[PDB]
């Protein structure tokens, strides 16, 4: 663990060491022979008080069979300590690399027992990180399937554990293979990562938010990853900007702005369209204008914010509310939409979603069907969608009623009746307009 200085690392080390047991008792219990017990004792006297070296290998072997006391999380306790303690962990990773036969066993040594070792597994099997050549791409790929890392990093209640896991993941990005493994994990961990920034939008919280921002930036450094995420976490693109705007920490804001700019980097596929959509929907352009007006002492953060502002200006130089309308139609789980603002844009929008023949609006038909399926439930998003889809249908039908037939044949009358059937407030509130 290169970053053991972090308070989370100190807590992990303290938790791991709080359950240490003597090797003499293990020898008395017949868990290991005299030589193995002596080696375990030497490893313990090295890690936390020559010591170690040839020892701590038999300690790991004993902990493989022993399932309690120091044998439960001895590897995690040794890793959490700094390399100054006889190079424990730091030299242990290199020694294991020199002996691949037990390497897998060492990788399996960590991530056992309670969270004290589960969280330290990311800092136990890969305590050396991607440096020194101890690990490999295959090891990271295999370890990315462990659920202990997800439980630790994404633990909403365990703020300290989540911050420690996020920091370890961010540090692991040194090697491109480790970065790819981290991106693969993020492809499924998206909920927790996005929620971290969402909570950061308004002292373990700051550290956790910074770790999440670092992980997001590291994953987003690859243009392909950012382009793929734009299709699943497009709202997160502006959520990160909002979190940075609320966040006062200079380094955290710099990281968030850098991640946002990377999302808009020319390398990212469809960079221009993505930037334009972000500016139009997430108010990234007004936010960048405010950041330019605002002042900060972080020179790197200032440069990142200026680059983001330039990207936003370029995106808005060819922006239109039609992109926002398309995004809203893609969402179909909201209460109101941009076109409801006034009668200006809708004047064209009435024939925009329909493609002048309702053909392009069939996607709007599917969105309304999904919103009606959700409408039968009382969820806030459900009621919002029930109202919004019906209001948009009424607005579209008010002009050029030909497409109404397509809606009528597609269950438009039945959908309107069901919206106002019963147990609905906004659904009926919009079905009234639809049927009027």
């Amino acid at each position: 663990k290169i970053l053991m200085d972090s308070t989370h690392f100190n807590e992990i080390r303290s938790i791991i060491r709080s359950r240490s047991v003597a090797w003499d008792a293990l020898a008395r219990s017949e868990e290991l022979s005299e030589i193995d017990a002596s080696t375990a004792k030497a490893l313990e006297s090295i890690l936390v008080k020559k010591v170690n070296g040839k020892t701590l290998i038999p300690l790991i072997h004993l902990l493989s069979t022993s399932d309690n006391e120091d044998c439960k999380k001895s590897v995690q306790n040794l890793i959490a300590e700094l390399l100054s303690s006889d190079k424990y962990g730091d030299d242990t990773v290199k020694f294991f690399q020199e002996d691949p036969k037990q390497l897998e066993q060492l990788f399996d040594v960590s991530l056992k027992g309670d969270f004290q070792t589960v969280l330290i597994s990311g800092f136990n099997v890969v305590s050396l990180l991607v440096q020194n050549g101890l690990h490999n791409v295959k090891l990271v790929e295999k370890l990315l399937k462990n659920n202990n890392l997800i439980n630790i990093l994404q633990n909403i209640e365990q703020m300290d554990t989540c911050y420690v896991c996020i920091r370890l993941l961010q540090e692991l990005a040194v090697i491109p293979e480790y970065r790819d493994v981290i991106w693969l994990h993020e492809k499924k961990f998206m909920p927790t990562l996005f929620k971290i920034l969402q909570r950061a939008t308004d002292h373990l919280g700051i550290q956790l938010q910074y770790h999440s921002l670092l992980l997001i930036w590291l994953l987003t450094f690859n243009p392909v990853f950012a382009n793929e995420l734009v299709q699943k976490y497009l709202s997160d693109f502006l959520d990160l900007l909002k979190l940075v705007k609320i966040t006062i920490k200079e380094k955290v804001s710099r990281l968030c702005i850098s991640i946002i700019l990377q999302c808009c980097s020319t390398r990212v596929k469809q960079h221009k369209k993505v930037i334009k959509q972000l500016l139009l929907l997430g108010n990234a352009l007004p936010t960048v204008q405010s950041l330019s007006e605002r002042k900060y002492s972080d020179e790197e953060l200032r440069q990142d914010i200026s680059n983001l502002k330039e990207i936003l200006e370029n995106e808005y130089q060819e922006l239109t509310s039609f992109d926002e309308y398309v995004a809203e139609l893609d969402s179909k789980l909201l209460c109101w939409s941009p076109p409801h603002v006034d009668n200006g844009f809708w004047s064209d929008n009435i024939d925009e979603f329909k493609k002048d023949n309702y053909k392009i609006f069939r996607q709007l038909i599917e969105l309304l069907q999904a919103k009606v399926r959700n409408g039968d439930v009382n969820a806030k998003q459900e009621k919002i969608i029930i109202q919004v889809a019906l209001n948009d249908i009424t607005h579209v039908v008010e002009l050029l009623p030909e497409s109404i037939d397509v809606l009528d044949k597609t269950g438009g009358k039945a959908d309107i009746m069901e919206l106002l059937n019963h147990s609905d407030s906004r659904v009926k509130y919009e079905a009234l307009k639809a049927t009027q």
Binding site: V174, W217, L218, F221, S258, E300
Partner: peptide, 24 residues
């Protein structure tokens, strides 16, 4: 910090690809 780490390959590999190999 990490910006320079990315720029390392962003320049060393990209420069040759876009200005050396294309001259072949």
């Amino acid at each position: 910090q990490l910006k320079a780490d990315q720029e390392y390959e962003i320049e060393k590999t990209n420069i040759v690809r876009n200005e050396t190999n294309n001259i072949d």
